[PDB]
């Protein structure tokens, strides 16, 4: 019967909540009350990358912390040299509604996708020197919202069909399917070890998956509205989620519950993007108020503001060496801050 | 090692030349979002404009040498609050409704127009509204089994507006039924419009040939109103 299953699920949720409350002896704020505040973080726009004609939805730094890919709603995927603002490649996309872009860790490939439900893989190191569509991954029944290369041959994608998928690029087939979200999966983040990843969906929930097994290891709630952004803490034992309820939150995989909420009363706009700095001390978040906020992750105090974007901040990336942070926006400009 | 610096310079110069050409192409095209329900006939509108798995369908047509790119959403879940933000900078949204929905999906269409009008990222986008099933609406009201008053009680005390221009050879009962539905969509538009975007209603049919011109004519008004605003002439 459906009813008895309803009470059984409710009782399971109740006992999970009771166990989580039992494990919650003290708050992270109480433990960190005796830590040194980071003061005021000041950053300046060192570079302004121009050349996109429409909204930027996605950026992704290279593993060399020098090149970066940017995806814009004019069918453009531009590789930039951030040091000199030089453009390396300008790939025209078949569909101009591109919501996500990825850069392969080896640097030989980029990926993109969006409202066409297709993940396009572009080879950057062709023998002739041009950039051609090396692969097209089809099978998602909703739009592509995020994609991250595990390596040159495997990629994990997030779709608006409430599912994530793991694709073997060479054969173009879905190696694995991750299901359990009920809303639109909006963002995925890959763990440093790459055996797990977290996904946040429109059901106001986050899920931790084992890449190899293909099963939902863990589920975290606490947000009130859609989760638009997610990122791991550098050590891989925690992750931050930004939502439309105008708050960011930090979750610990081992504690299995919420640790700290980053919100302010004067903030009434949702978070579009989140990112951690090199040590994980600073949590950067993009907003609809056209700004970015640098929060002290351990204390939940706004350490700084990045301002200079004329429209909604859609993108947020920190380099692997932690030298610079890049923000894309709906004003069609990329900004490199240091 | 400055030779590589020069090589990067010319690679950028070529890329930016191509980007200038692409910008010239991009700014001369009008992008349109086509919305509607299953029983609205917007697919027939696409077929008429063309002849005269995948998550989005695209349509190219030219009116008076001006290029239009109409985008129709397919193979997506009914939850549209996330992918609707991709169309915050289109020239217009073409909203198609079955005017003979009752006997009623008309109230569902009214709320669909309500969400588009008041969405924070679509506040600046004008809506071309197409009352589509006019031929089926005409026969329904004449049959005497329509009874629009049971779904909309305000139709009992409604009177045809003075500015209304009936087509020749049209029953007066059809005219007020036809115009009452338009005023239901117009009261949503008039509220909270604030002059930053407008609604252009049209009484269309399944196979009207002039549907390309109507989109062209409303896009001229939208673009002209935008330039006049930039000069504070409006």
């Amino acid at each position, epitope marked *: 019967e459906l009813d008895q299953l*309803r009470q059984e699920a409710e009782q399971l*949720k109740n006992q999970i909540r009771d166990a989580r409350k039992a494990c919650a002896d003290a708050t992270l704020s109480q433990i960190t009350n005796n830590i040194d505040p980071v003061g005021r973080i000041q950053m300046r726009t060192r570079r302004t990358l121009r050349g996109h004609l429409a909204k930027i939805y996605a950026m992704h730094w290279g593993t060399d912390s020098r090149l970066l890919v940017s995806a814009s709603q004019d069918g453009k995927l531009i590789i930039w040299d951030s040091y000199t603002t030089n453009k390396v490649h300008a790939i025209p996309l078949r569909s101009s509604w591109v919501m996500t872009c990825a850069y392969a860790p080896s640097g030989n490939y980029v990926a993109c996708g969006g409202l066409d439900n297709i993940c396009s893989i572009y080879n950057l190191k062709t023998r002739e020197g041009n950039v051609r569509v090396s692969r097209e991954l089809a099978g998602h029944t909703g739009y592509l919202s995020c994609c991250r290369f595990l390596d040159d041959n495997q990629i994990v994608t997030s779709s608006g069909d409430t599912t994530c998928a793991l694709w073997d690029i060479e054969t173009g087939q879905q190696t694995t399917t991750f299901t359990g979200h*009920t*809303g639109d999966v909006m963002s995925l983040s890959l763990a440093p070890d790459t055996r797990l990843f977290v996904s946040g969906a*429109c*059901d*106001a*929930s986050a899920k931790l998956w084992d890449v190899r097994e293909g099963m939902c290891r863990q589920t975290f*709630t*606490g947000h*009130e*509205s*859609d989760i638009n952004a997610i990122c791991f803490f550098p050590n891989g034992n925690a992750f931050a989620t930004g939502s*439309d*309820d*105008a708050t960011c939150r930090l979750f610990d995989l081992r504690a299995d519950q919420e640790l700290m909420t980053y919100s302010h009363d004067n903030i*009434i706009c*949702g978070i579009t993007s989140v990112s951690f700095s090199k040590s994980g001390r600073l949590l950067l978040a993009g907003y609809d108020d056209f700004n970015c906020n640098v929060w002290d992750a351990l204390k939940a105090d706004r350490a700084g503001v990045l301002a200079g974007h004329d429209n909604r901040v859609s993108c947020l990336g920190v380099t692997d060496d932690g030298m610079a942070v890049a923000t894309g926006s709906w004003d069609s400009f990329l900004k490199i801050w240091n | 090692q400055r030779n590589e610096e020069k090589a990067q310079r010319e690679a950028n110069k070529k890329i930016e030349k191509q980007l200038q050409k692409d910008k010239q192409v991009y700014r001369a095209t009008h992008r349109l979002l086509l919305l509607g329900a299953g029983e609205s006939g917007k697919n027939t509108i696409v077929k008429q404009m063309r002849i005269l798995t995948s998550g989005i369908f695209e349509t190219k047509f030219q009116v008076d040498k001006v290029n239009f790119h109409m985008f129709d959403v397919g193979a997506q*879940r*009914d*939850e*549209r*609050r996330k992918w*609707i933000q991709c169309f915050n900078d289109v020239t217009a949204i073409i909203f198609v409704v079955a005017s003979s929905s009752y006997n009623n999906r008309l*109230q*569902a269409a009214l*709320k669909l127009f*309500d*969400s*588009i*009008w*008041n*969405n*924070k990222w679509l506040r600046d986008t004008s809506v071309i509204l197409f009352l589509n099933k006019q031929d089926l609406l005409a026969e329904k009201v004449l049959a005497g089994k329509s009874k629009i008053e*049971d*779904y*909309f*009680p*305000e139709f009992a005390r409604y009177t045809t507006p003075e500015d209304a221009t009936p087509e020749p050879g049209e029953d007066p009962r059809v005219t007020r039924a036809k115009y009452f539905i338009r005023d239901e969509f117009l009261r949503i538009s008039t509220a*909270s419009g604030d002059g930053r975007h407008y609604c252009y209603p049209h009484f269309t049919c399944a196979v009207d040939t002039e549907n390309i011109r109507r989109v062209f004519n409303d896009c001229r008004d939208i673009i002209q109103r935008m330039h006049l605003r930039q000069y504070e002439l409006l």
Partner: nanobody
Amino acid sequence: QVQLQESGGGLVQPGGSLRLSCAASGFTFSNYKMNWVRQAPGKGLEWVSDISQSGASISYTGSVKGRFTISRDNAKNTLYLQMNSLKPEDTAVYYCARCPAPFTRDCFDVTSTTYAYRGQGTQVTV
């Protein structure tokens, strides 16, 4: 977790009266526009009523004008639908729905098939 519990449904005589209560937990109730939606047997899911954060703005579907009253108590985090003079076509499952984002004028897909912020519903038989 966001949770909406609907109660008060049951079997009522035609022309009778009934009151549906929606207890909302897991979010700031006062920040959100609220809705009542319906699922009649053998057809789709339809929106019937909505109320804003304060209660100043109230709207109904045409078939329930002068018949249903939507009220909201932010202190007890609760929503009410007072149904007067029930008709046999009012027999349906009633779902208390929340708008996806706080203090927003638009409310997309609260009438969708698998909307997350919607309750399990209560059955009203007339």
